Design an enzyme around this catalytic site. Structure first.
Site, short mmCIF file in Angstrom:
data_model
loop_
_atom_site.label_atom_id
_atom_site.label_comp_id
_atom_site.label_asym_id
_atom_site.label_seq_id
_atom_site.Cartn_x
_atom_site.Cartn_y
_atom_site.Cartn_z
CG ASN A 39 5.11 -4.89 -11.18
OD1 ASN A 39 6.15 -5.30 -11.69
ND2 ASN A 39 4.89 -3.60 -10.92
CD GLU B 94 0.08 1.27 -13.19
OE1 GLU B 94 -0.22 1.27 -11.97
OE2 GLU B 94 1.17 1.73 -13.62
NE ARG C 289 13.91 6.39 -11.27
CZ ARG C 289 12.65 5.93 -11.31
NH1 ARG C 289 11.63 6.74 -11.56
NH2 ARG C 289 12.42 4.64 -11.13
CG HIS D 32 4.61 5.69 -15.60
ND1 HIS D 32 5.34 6.84 -15.41
CD2 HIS D 32 4.84 4.92 -14.51
CE1 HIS D 32 5.98 6.77 -14.26
NE2 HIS D 32 5.69 5.61 -13.69
N1 LIG Z 1 15.14 1.25 -14.30
C1 LIG Z 1 13.90 0.80 -14.61
N2 LIG Z 1 13.61 0.39 -15.87
C2 LIG Z 1 12.38 -0.06 -16.18
N3 LIG Z 1 11.37 -0.14 -15.30
C3 LIG Z 1 11.52 0.24 -14.00
C4 LIG Z 1 12.83 0.74 -13.57
N4 LIG Z 1 12.72 1.04 -12.26
C5 LIG Z 1 11.45 0.75 -11.87
N5 LIG Z 1 10.73 0.27 -12.91
C6 LIG Z 1 9.31 -0.17 -12.91
O1 LIG Z 1 8.38 0.88 -13.19
C7 LIG Z 1 7.10 0.53 -12.66
C8 LIG Z 1 6.45 1.72 -11.97
O2 LIG Z 1 7.33 2.21 -10.96
P1 LIG Z 1 7.09 3.64 -10.25
O3 LIG Z 1 6.96 4.69 -11.32
O4 LIG Z 1 8.16 3.78 -9.19
O5 LIG Z 1 5.65 3.38 -9.58
P2 LIG Z 1 4.49 4.49 -9.49
O6 LIG Z 1 3.71 4.47 -10.77
O7 LIG Z 1 5.06 5.77 -8.92
O8 LIG Z 1 3.50 3.87 -8.37
P3 LIG Z 1 3.77 3.85 -6.77
O9 LIG Z 1 2.69 2.97 -6.19
O10 LIG Z 1 5.21 3.53 -6.46
O11 LIG Z 1 3.47 5.39 -6.31
P4 LIG Z 1 1.99 6.01 -6.12
O12 LIG Z 1 1.29 6.14 -7.47
O13 LIG Z 1 1.26 5.29 -5.00
O14 LIG Z 1 2.32 7.49 -5.58
C9 LIG Z 1 3.06 7.66 -4.38
C10 LIG Z 1 3.10 9.14 -4.07
O15 LIG Z 1 1.75 9.62 -4.01
C11 LIG Z 1 1.66 10.48 -2.86
N6 LIG Z 1 0.34 10.56 -2.22
C12 LIG Z 1 -0.48 9.55 -1.88
N7 LIG Z 1 -1.59 10.04 -1.28
C13 LIG Z 1 -1.48 11.38 -1.22
C14 LIG Z 1 -2.28 12.52 -0.71
N8 LIG Z 1 -3.49 12.31 -0.13
N9 LIG Z 1 -1.77 13.77 -0.87
C15 LIG Z 1 -0.57 14.00 -1.45
N10 LIG Z 1 0.20 13.01 -1.92
C16 LIG Z 1 -0.19 11.71 -1.85
C17 LIG Z 1 2.63 9.90 -1.86
O16 LIG Z 1 3.00 10.90 -0.90
C18 LIG Z 1 3.77 9.50 -2.75
O17 LIG Z 1 4.62 10.64 -2.89
C19 LIG Z 1 7.33 -0.63 -11.69
O18 LIG Z 1 6.71 -1.81 -12.20
C20 LIG Z 1 8.84 -0.77 -11.58
O19 LIG Z 1 9.27 -2.13 -11.41
#
Ligand SMILES: Nc1ncnc2c1ncn2[C@@H]1O[C@H](COP(=O)(O)OP(=O)(O)OP(=O)(O)OP(=O)(O)OC[C@H]2O[C@@H](n3cnc4c(N)ncnc43)[C@H](O)[C@@H]2O)[C@@H](O)[C@H]1O
Ligand SMILES: Nc1ncnc2c1ncn2[C@@H]1O[C@H](COP(=O)(O)OP(=O)(O)OP(=O)(O)OP(=O)(O)OC[C@H]2O[C@@H](n3cnc4c(N)ncnc43)[C@H](O)[C@@H]2O)[C@@H](O)[C@H]1O
Lengths: 394, 394
Positions: free
Chosen positions: A8, A378, A233, A172
């Site tokens: 990615n 993924e 966001r 997603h």
């Molecule tokens: N304009 C655009 N157009 C098109 N595509 C674009 C774009 N901008 C971006 N993209 C693309 O979209 C794709 C996905 O991006 P994102 O949507 O940003 O990624 P994500 O699925 O949120 O995964 P991430 O790893 O960042 O967060 P996580 O699930 O760990 O979750 C993190 C959260 O989980 C929480 N968490 C973890 N452990 C926890 C616990 N024990 N208790 C409570 N919360 C917890 C953390 O606190 C944190 O808040 C990327 O490939 C990106 O390039």
């Protein structure tokens, strides 16, 4: 013992993983970070943050390519999977990358320019460094291509759709697809007579209604800015509100775009952090704006889950996934309690369990809808697509 | 034999009605139209479009004041009711108009400047022309003031809320209030243990969740631009989409505001009309974009009805109202068929009946939720508030 290299190649990083073909297990993972910058580095398994100062997208992958060779992995790379941000209307499934696919990804790139031009930068690099290796593109929009026009049209003048391609795409897609396929097993559902809502809750966040194995509604829009409130966001925001702000503060559309995308959400409301763990503790410590951000966050999730349910003939399951959805006992419970109207009953002993327990049901027996947590994967979904496509003749 | 004069003094018109206090029946109605313009006229009961060229808001009402006097009505005007567009956070109920109320309406006016400054223009005129007459202000936002912060906050930075008052207000409050009060009778519900969704579907359109007699969610925003697709308004639109359009076409926020508000919606998608009767016939005649506009329109209504249902503990009723909701057999049926997930069963013989049949249930017995049509009566709601306030000591 062949492997798949998954990539990615984002706007400022290259996340990668090496999965074994026979078992789909991760053998290696890492993240090249600080891309196109002076301070660029490569942390494999969080073990040796190797400096790679002033390095392009191909330099980062040439670094990574050597690390695979230092571990005698380079010669077992049978397949390479690329995550693509946006496939417009051209891509409805995963494809073997060819000159045509490159042109077509390039054609849809204006829809997500930052992110797609980084994906192409990554394909370019990988094609160079692995020329005899079959490669596969997997698009985050493609699963949502089964949306009907009524579900993907905006209420803008028709001109903006037909000439400028302004419509809902949703994202997603790989997660929503993966997680929904896994739910049919966990919940013992027939894919072809089924109705699911998947809540992908991470830093970015979206809902997807999956009717009979097919996406029929999703919360993100033309861009990731629509729908749920997320880390930074805002989610859905009254355009009249945004226009009213413009007049009042002198800000431009561009300015307000940055605010909505980078300074809003959990971060924006709380004034503390985009991180939910930080905010869960803040609320616990009596912080009021942390409590509001989370309540607002939960309320908009509940509202879209129920709203996406309208595109189903019957609701069999709600599935939580992503960093927040896999790990937040609180948010899951709050959201589900906010959906008592749909007949949900949480089992709190089941909801208390950490993510180590994997795919798991978290609702009581009386519950009219099954609720479950299903960790997304993924990279595995991309590899499975790659594996399947490795049997094809091009 | 006292009467109440009700006034809605919009941006380009003054709609008025004279209701009898004892029975609340309309004795006179009319519309001054083309306000602040060269060609201004006054059509009472659509009977004699009397020209009033180049006339201000007070001229129009001074015209109307004489017409009441020509019919010996002027001396039975015991009460005057004013419809106010926006009450910000200051107004949570209807009030006897005093100097304080005027100042306060003037303070909240930046939130809806076009429309509120026309409301004040109308109060000014009426106060002059009827100085010994008690007068009452009824605000379209006030019913929604029971929304919790989680339901009214945007995911913008907290600064925009606390200093600039950027939050959801919602509109059609008088209709939603009126119609929900009437539903408790029709459906034999206890107000204090009840859950309703009201779909006010006219030229402007909004949903309201009413839990235990109180608004707990509504679809419009800070402005009428949020939520449902409507006659000329787009409804919910991805801000990222709007920003992407800006770059592509050179258009400004102001330009795109006009598009979203005046050229979008049923008008925008169909390319024919904002009028649903025109589009119902167009679809019937094989028109495809008319069919899409209506399907899109229906889909966004279904999605918000279900989504606003999440703010209820239990769903007892869905009530349709407004010009479209009272009169469209098709749209009602389409929407309800789009909500089979909630257990709704339409009775098509009951749904076929015209609006002449008044307050009426339109769902079968097996239906888990009662569906009904209830004609709204904003002028009557305003008068009833006025009547009650006529017993007060100020
Ligand atoms: N304009 C655009 N157009 C098109 N595509 C674009 C774009 N901008 C971006 N993209 C693309 O979209 C794709 C996905 O991006 P994102 O949507 O940003 O990624 P994500 O699925 O949120 O995964 P991430 O790893 O960042 O967060 P996580 O699930 O760990 O979750 C993190 C959260 O989980 C929480 N968490 C973890 N452990 C926890 C616990 N024990 N208790 C409570 N919360 C917890 C953390 O606190 C944190 O808040 C990327 O490939 C990106 O390039
Ligand atoms: N920026 C702002 N801020 C604050 N306040 C603001 C504002 N802008 C405006 N406002 C205020 O908001 C208030 C309400 O405005 P609107 O929201 O515009 O008014 P409305 O309730 O839609 O009523 P209207 O009479 O226009 O339409 P109708 O129900 O007849 O329904 C008409 C529809 O019904 C349809 N219909 C009628 N009969 C039918 C039939 N038999 N079959 C199918 N459709 C039928 C018609 O085709 C048509 O499509 C106003 O006081 C206004 O001043």
């Amino acid at each position: 013992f062949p492997v798949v290299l998954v990539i990615n190649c984002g706007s400022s990083s290259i996340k990668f993983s090496v999965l074994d073909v026979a078992t789909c297990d991760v053998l290696m993972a890492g993240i090249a970070d600080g891309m196109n910058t002076e301070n660029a580095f490569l942390s494999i398994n969080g073990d040796k943050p190797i400096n790679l100062a002033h390095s392009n997208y191909e330099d980062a992958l040439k670094a990574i390519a050597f690390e695979l060779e230092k571990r005698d992995l380079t010669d077992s790379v049978a397949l390479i999977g690329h995550r693509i941000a946006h496939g417009g209307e051209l891509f409805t499934q995963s494809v073997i990358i060819t000159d045509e696919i490159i042109d077509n990804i390039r054609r849809v790139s204006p829809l997500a320019p930052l992110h797609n031009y980084a994906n192409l930068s990554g394909i370019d690099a990988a094609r160079h460094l692995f020329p005899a290796v079959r490669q596969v593109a997997v698009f985050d929009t493609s699963f949502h291509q089964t949306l009907a026009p009524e579900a993907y049209l905006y209420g803008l003048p028709w001109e903006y759709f037909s000439s400028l391609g302004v419509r809902r795409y949703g994202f997603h897609g790989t997660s929503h697809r993966y997680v929904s396929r896994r739910a049919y097993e966990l919940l013992d559902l027939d894919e072809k007579d089924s109705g699911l809502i998947v809540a992908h809750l991470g830093n970015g966040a979206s809902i997807c209604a999956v009717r009979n194995g097919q996406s029929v509604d999703t919360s993100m829009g033309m861009t990731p800015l629509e729908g749920l409130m997320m880390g930074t966001r805002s989610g859905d925001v009254d355009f009249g509100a945004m226009a009213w702000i413009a007049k009042e503060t002198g800000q431009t559309l561009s300015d307000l775009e940055r605010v909505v995308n980078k300074e809003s959400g959990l971060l924006g409301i709380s004034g503390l952090s985009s991180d939910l763990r930080v905010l869960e503790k803040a609320w616990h410590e009596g912080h009021e704006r942390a409590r509001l951000a989370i309540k607002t966050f939960v309320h908009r999730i509940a509202r879209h889950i129920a709203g996406h349910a309208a595109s189903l003939h019957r609701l069999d399951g709600i599935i939580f996934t992503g960093g927040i959805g896999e790990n937040s006992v609180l948010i899951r419970q709050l959201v589900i309690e906010h959906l008592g109207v749909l007949g949900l009953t949480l089992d709190v002993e089941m909801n208390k369990q950490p993510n180590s327990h994997g795919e798991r049901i978290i609702s009581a027996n009386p519950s009219q809808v099954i609720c479950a947590v299903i960790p997304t994967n993924e990279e595995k979904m991309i590899a499975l697509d790659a594996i399947h496509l490795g049997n094809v003749k091009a």
